[PDB]
Amino acid sequence: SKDTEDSRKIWRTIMLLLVFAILLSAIIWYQITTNPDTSQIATLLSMQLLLIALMLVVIALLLSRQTEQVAESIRRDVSALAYVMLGLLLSLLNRLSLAAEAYKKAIELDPNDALAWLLLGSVLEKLKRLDEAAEAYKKAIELKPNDASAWKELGKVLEKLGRLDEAAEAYKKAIELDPEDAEAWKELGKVLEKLGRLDEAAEAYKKAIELDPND
Amino acid sequence: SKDTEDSRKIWRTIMLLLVFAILLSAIIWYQITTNPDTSQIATLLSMQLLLIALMLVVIALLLSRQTEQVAESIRRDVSALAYVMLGLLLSLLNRLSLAAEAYKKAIELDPNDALAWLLLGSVLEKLKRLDEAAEAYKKAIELKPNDASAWKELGKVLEKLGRLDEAAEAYKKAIELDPEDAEAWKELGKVLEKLGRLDEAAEAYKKAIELDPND
Amino acid sequence: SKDTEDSRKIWRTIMLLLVFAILLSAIIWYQITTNPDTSQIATLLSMQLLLIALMLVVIALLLSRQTEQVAESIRRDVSALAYVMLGLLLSLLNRLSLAAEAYKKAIELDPNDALAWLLLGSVLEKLKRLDEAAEAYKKAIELKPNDASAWKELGKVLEKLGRLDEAAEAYKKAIELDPEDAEAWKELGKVLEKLGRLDEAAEAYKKAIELDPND
Amino acid sequence: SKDTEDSRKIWRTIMLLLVFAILLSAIIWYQITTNPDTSQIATLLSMQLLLIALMLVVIALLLSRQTEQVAESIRRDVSALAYVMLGLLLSLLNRLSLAAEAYKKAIELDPNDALAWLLLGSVLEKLKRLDEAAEAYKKAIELKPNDASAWKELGKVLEKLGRLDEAAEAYKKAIELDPEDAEAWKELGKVLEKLGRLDEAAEAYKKAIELDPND
């Protein structure tokens, strides 16, 4: 919201430069009429003209700054979307290492781009960069706590890392967010079975079968 | 067309600030020559200078505003296309929940983006969000009444919702718009048969077969 | 190149508004020193101030115009690329009617976008809009006479339209541009055979086989 | 960093135009009070007004220039990403010749776009433009010396060109950068065997098998 604050400061600055020159000019109009002495009258006109000159230059400097501020903001916002989109295209051609870089660039431009973080996570898992993938998913999840897909995907990475207990918890969270996700239920089952949690595993397996009879 | 109206107001404002200063300055040129009294002459010069100072500041404020107005309009238009495109890419990777969000964002930026509405509809159906899908298709159709594809897709959602009568009507409209759409004819047939409208179902089935002998 | 011409006119205008005010101001500096009469001196100062006031307003109006001109040019260029890209994405999801509209939009924004014309052609053929497809390909070809792919694709549309003679010519042109295109050779063969041009058909068939022994 | 240098020159110019007018105006305020002679006082006011007029015009010209500089920079950066993205989409539809052109355009806009160079390389290989592909890969590699994928892809082009020795070296570099790349190891093996380097070929083949038992 800094732009709102800065905009108000810019407007106030322009106003104040003029108001000062206005008030003095109004004073001078009176003073010139009152005291008919060229050497005082002209001195006041020179001062008025000087204040105006400064005012206008400062204003031009403010226009320059605002033009740049606006333009940079747009450049950034456009680029961040372009990098996410680029990563998606690179991923479609299986240019996974390059896709990861594109997502990384979107993140640097906008660190709370949960999508870029999620997608980075996916690419890193596909590239077998499992530890880095888990961290990327963790970030996407903190940004969006109710992203059931991110939770499920985290689950898969954690299982691959041998983190069966944490994997089971991540799958369980995806399920609470969306109980019909038969895949999540089956994968939860697999983790629980592997983990020795046979009764829970059996229930998870059953839910995948029962929830959608055409799975 | 508000921008056209605002542009005209901005131009008129700049013109009027100057015209007032012009007319007065022309008056002052005469008055100075006519009445050779420094205390009156300078008073008029001070006033002229003040009007100019205000004029120029106001103009600078208008330049600032117009710069921002133009820039924001562009940012919005660019972003709305980017969100539709993003949704399409996310859909290609089967990131359907995320694709739906991207289409939603395009809609908020432009509520009459029939494409975003149609596509949202498609994603929602694929995600089994059938009631929401029907509403999204309805919006796309109101925006584009002769979108035969949107009508056919609405038909599919309505049938899935058990709305066989409404589904048959939606398929029929797609067909009137494009009579060669064998798929629409076959799907119409399926609805009509399910609906007990056996004679109409038979005709619809026949048209799908007859319209294109290599279907 | 109109922008170059307009830019020069804008610069010249700004220069001339100032140069006139400069020359007169220099004249006035001399005249004030020479003729010590307040009623003449001030009259000249008022005139100088008025010319400056006009100059600056006109300049501000020019800044406004140039800002808008630049911004609009960019908006158009960005949008035209976005529409081609959109059409390609819609085509990947088989949203062919929508893909055609996106290409059409790119064309309206830039009528010499051979790519958009070519792609439109392709979509129209896929949509069975063969007559329209032939015209779109014709436009892409006039824009790029050495686009062997566009010539081959035109060939396919023309054959589908029953225009076997014109199809054979379009295939032949694609071949002259790229003689190794075994597909073009085979398709030329098919047209020539269908057309009764059996000796030429035989040669075309042989070239497809001989050019690349692993075709 | 030229923009930083130019920005500083623009700011300094605006400052200096004003500072000169300030210093002189301050001098004039004193001189008017000191020497009560209209013909000298007004001469100084005219001069002050002239300096201001010039200053403001020059500033407006600088605003115009900066607006254009900023806008052009953005246009270029946006377009270069769009061309890479366009090439990727064209490649997905197998519009390879067109994809190559899009990558070429991105390169002209930004000659150190390693991604565009790499991708161009890939398209050229797919299009059987092997000599050109090798050069494009060489450029991508010089820009990014630790792009293991670019090294492997260069390897494939070089082998296709009959350059078995250079191909083996390119594959070896990809392997040093990423030792788990079983594909690179197998392809290295194939080159080494073809090249008569049977003992090295055997080791390379073994590594592909041993590195990932599920390859």
Question: With contact defined as beta carbons under 8 Å apart, do C96 and C120 qualify?
Answer: no
| Distance from C-alpha of D46 to C-alpha of D25, rounded to nearest angstrom | 11
Phi, psi dihedrals of residue C137, rounded to the nearest 5°:
-65, -40
| Distance from C-alpha of C153 to C-alpha of C167, rounded to nearest angstrom | 9
Token pair of C158 as six digits:
């023309």
| Cα-based torsion angle of the residue sequence B152, B155, B159, B165 in order, rounded to the nearest 10 degrees | -130
Token pair of A26 as six digits:
């109004």
Partners of C55 on chain B (C-beta within 8 Å) are: none
Partners of B118 on chain C (C-beta within 8 Å) are: 98
Instruction: Residue D131: count other Cβ atoms within 10 Å of its Cβ.
Output: 10
Nearest CA in chain C to B64: C64
CB C25 to CB D98 under 8 A? no
* Domain coverage including residue B46: 1-215
Report the gap between the CA of B32 and the closest CA in chain C (Å).
5
Nearest CA in chain A to D94: A93
| Distance from C-alpha of C35 to C-alpha of C33, rounded to nearest angstrom | 6
| Cα-based torsion angle of the residue sequence B76, B81, B85, B88 in order, rounded to the nearest 10 degrees | 100
Instruction: Residue D108: count other Cβ atoms within 10 Å of its Cβ.
Output: 12
| Distance from C-alpha of D39 to C-alpha of C39, rounded to nearest angstrom | 11
CB C32 to CB D49 under 8 A? no
Location of structure tokens 């080159």: D191
Helix (H) / strand (E) element for A65: namely helix A38-92
Enter the resolution in angstroms: 3.9
Number of structural domains chain D divides into: 1
CA distances from B190 to B150, B171, B182, C191 (A): 18, 11, 12, 40
The residues, any chain, with a CB within 8 Å of residue C191's CB and separated by 6 or more, are: C155, C159, C164, C167, C168, C171, C201
Angle at which helix A38-92 crosses helix D38-92, to 10 degrees, equals 10
Token pair of D51 as six digits:
């300096």
> What amino acid is encoded at D56 in this protein?
L
Mind giving me the DSSP string for C149-175?
HHHHHHHHHHHHTT-HHHHHHHHHHHH
A161 touches chain B (CB under 8 A): no
Mind giving me the DSSP string for chain B?
-HHHHHHHHHHHHHHHHHHHHHHHHHHHHHHHHHS--HHHHHHHHHHHHHHHHHHHHHHHHHHHHHHHHHHHHHHHHHHHHHHHHHHHHHHHTT-HHHHHHHHHHHHHH-TT-HHHHHHHHHHHHHTT-HHHHHHHHHHHHHH-TT-HHHHHHHHHHHHHTT-HHHHHHHHHHHHHH-TT-HHHHHHHHHHHHHTT-HHHHHHHHHHHHHH-TT-
| Cα-based torsion angle of the residue sequence B188, B190, B191, B192 in order, rounded to the nearest 10 degrees | 80
The residues, any chain, with a CB within 8 Å of residue A126's CB and separated by 6 or more, are: A96
Location of structure tokens 């290409």: C103
How many residue contacts between B and C have a Cβ separation below 8 Å? Answer: 116
Token pair of B139 as six digits:
């919006």
Instruction: Residue C197: count other Cβ atoms within 10 Å of its Cβ.
Output: 18
Token pair of A58 as six digits:
């400062």
Find the distance separating the first CA and the last CA of chain A, reported in whole Å.
49
Question: With contact defined as beta carbons under 8 Å apart, do D73 and A77 qualify?
Answer: no
* Residue length of chain B: 215
Token pair of A64 as six digits:
């320059």
Residue D204, Cβ density class (10 Å: 0-12 exposed, 13-18 middle, ≥19 buried): buried
Which chains are within 8 Å of D by 3+ CB pairs? Answer: A, C
Q: What is the 3-state secondary structure (H, E, C) of A144-203?
A: CCCCHHHHHHHHHHHHHCCCHHHHHHHHHHHHHHCCCCHHHHHHHHHHHHHCCCHHHHHH
Which chains are within 8 Å of C by 3+ CB pairs? Answer: B, D
* Residue length of chain D: 215
Look up residue D112 and give its DSSP letter: T
> What amino acid is encoded at D135 in this protein?
E
> What amino acid is encoded at A14 in this protein?
I
Location of structure tokens 């210093």: D23
CB D68 to CB C70 under 8 A? yes
C70 touches chain B (CB under 8 A): no
The residues, any chain, with a CB within 8 Å of residue D169's CB and separated by 6 or more, are: none
| Distance from C-alpha of A57 to C-alpha of C51, rounded to nearest angstrom | 19
The residues, any chain, with a CB within 8 Å of residue B123's CB and separated by 6 or more, are: B87, B91, B96, B99, B100, B103
Instruction: Provide the b/e sequence for C32-49 (b: ≥16 CB within 10 Å).
Output: beeeeebbbbbbbbbbbb
Partners of B42 on chain C (C-beta within 8 Å) are: 42
| Distance from C-alpha of C130 to C-alpha of C122, rounded to nearest angstrom | 10
Q: How many helices (H) and strands (E) does chain B have?
A: 9, 0
Asked how this structure was determined, the answer is X-ray
| Distance from C-alpha of B149 to C-alpha of B138, rounded to nearest angstrom | 12
| Distance from C-alpha of B147 to C-alpha of A133, rounded to nearest angstrom | 43
| Distance from C-alpha of A187 to C-alpha of A201, rounded to nearest angstrom | 9
Nearest CA in chain B to A69: B68
Question: With contact defined as beta carbons under 8 Å apart, do D82 and D105 qualify?
Answer: no
CB C10 to CB D61 under 8 A? no
Q: Of the candidates C153, C82, C92, C83, which has an alpha carbon nearest to the alpha carbon of residue C124?
A: C153
Question: With contact defined as beta carbons under 8 Å apart, do C123 and C91 qualify?
Answer: yes
Partners of B71 on chain A (C-beta within 8 Å) are: 70-71, 74
B86 touches chain A (CB under 8 A): yes
Question: With contact defined as beta carbons under 8 Å apart, do A166 and A158 qualify?
Answer: yes
| Distance from C-alpha of D170 to C-alpha of D148, rounded to nearest angstrom | 9
| Distance from C-alpha of C189 to C-alpha of C168, rounded to nearest angstrom | 8
Sign of CA dihedral D55, D58, D60, D62: negative
User: Nearest Cβ partner of A74 from B37, B63, B71?
Assistant: B71
Q: Of the candidates A43, A115, A122, which has an alpha carbon nearest to the alpha carbon of residue A83?
A: A115
Q: Of the candidates D142, D93, D150, which has an alpha carbon nearest to the alpha carbon of residue D120?
A: D150
The residues, any chain, with a CB within 8 Å of residue C114's CB and separated by 6 or more, are: C139, C140, C143, C144, C147, C150
Hey, of C18, C19, C51, C62, which one would you mutate to test binding to chain D, going by the most D CBs within 10 A of its CB?
C18
C50 touches chain D (CB under 8 A): no
| Distance from C-alpha of A184 to C-alpha of B109, rounded to nearest angstrom | 34
| Distance from C-alpha of C211 to C-alpha of A125, rounded to nearest angstrom | 44
Question: With contact defined as beta carbons under 8 Å apart, do A1 and A28 qualify?
Answer: no
CA distances from C162 to B207, C67, C121, C158, D122 (A): 25, 53, 17, 6, 38
Instruction: Residue D177: count other Cβ atoms within 10 Å of its Cβ.
Output: 17
Token pair of B28 as six digits:
């002052």
Three-state DSSP state, A42: helix
Report the gap between the CA of A63 and the closest CA in chain D (Å).
8
Provide the CB-side half-sphere exposure for D171 (13 A, CA): 27
The C-alpha R_g of chain D, in whole angstroms, comes to 32
| Distance from C-alpha of C157 to C-alpha of C132, rounded to nearest angstrom | 10
| Distance from C-alpha of C14 to C-alpha of C8, rounded to nearest angstrom | 10
Q: What is the 3-state secondary structure (H, E, C) of B11-50?
A: HHHHHHHHHHHHHHHHHHHHHHHHCCCHHHHHHHHHHHHH
Phi, psi dihedrals of residue D93, rounded to the nearest 5°:
-90, 5
Report the gap between the CA of D17 and the closest CA in chain A (Å).
9
Angle at which helix B38-92 crosses helix B2-34, to 10 degrees, equals 170
Token pair of D211 as six digits:
């590195």
| Cα-based torsion angle of the residue sequence A147, A153, A157, A162 in order, rounded to the nearest 10 degrees | 90
C20 touches chain D (CB under 8 A): no
Q: Of the candidates B133, B213, B202, which has an alpha carbon nearest to the alpha carbon of residue B170?
A: B133
- C-alpha of C207 from chain center: 37
| Distance from C-alpha of B43 to C-alpha of B49, rounded to nearest angstrom | 10
Token pair of B1 as six digits:
């067309």
Q: Of the candidates A96, A136, A131, A130, which has an alpha carbon nearest to the alpha carbon of residue A115?
A: A136
B71 touches chain A (CB under 8 A): yes
Sign of CA dihedral B45, B48, B52, B54: positive
Partners of B39 on chain A (C-beta within 8 Å) are: 32-33, 35-36, 41
Question: With contact defined as beta carbons under 8 Å apart, do B92 and A89 qualify?
Answer: no
Look up residue C35 and give its DSSP letter: S
Tell me the residues of chain B between 95 and 134 that have a Cβ less than 8 Å away from chain C: 115, 118
Angle, CA of D67, D73 and D74, to the nearest 5°:
90
Token pair of D45 as six digits:
């006011």
- C-alpha of A148 from chain center: 20
C54 touches chain D (CB under 8 A): no
D28 touches chain A (CB under 8 A): yes
| Distance from C-alpha of B81 to C-alpha of C90, rounded to nearest angstrom | 13
- C-alpha of B180 from chain center: 31
The C-alpha R_g of chain B, in whole angstroms, comes to 32
Helix, strand, coil share (%) of chain D residues, nearest 5: 85, 0, 15
The residues, any chain, with a CB within 8 Å of residue A123's CB and separated by 6 or more, are: A87, A91, A96, A99, A100, A103
| Distance from C-alpha of A34 to C-alpha of A48, rounded to nearest angstrom | 17
Q: How many helices (H) and strands (E) does chain C have?
A: 9, 0
| Distance from C-alpha of C50 to C-alpha of C16, rounded to nearest angstrom | 15
> What amino acid is encoded at D167 in this protein?
A
Look up residue D35 and give its DSSP letter: S
CA distances from C118 to C87, C112, C147, C186 (A): 12, 11, 10, 22
| Distance from C-alpha of C26 to C-alpha of C34, rounded to nearest angstrom | 13
Instruction: Residue D119: count other Cβ atoms within 10 Å of its Cβ.
Output: 27
Question: With contact defined as beta carbons under 8 Å apart, do A51 and B51 qualify?
Answer: no
CA distances from B166 to B142, B150, B188, C174 (A): 16, 14, 11, 50
CB A53 to CB D21 under 8 A? yes
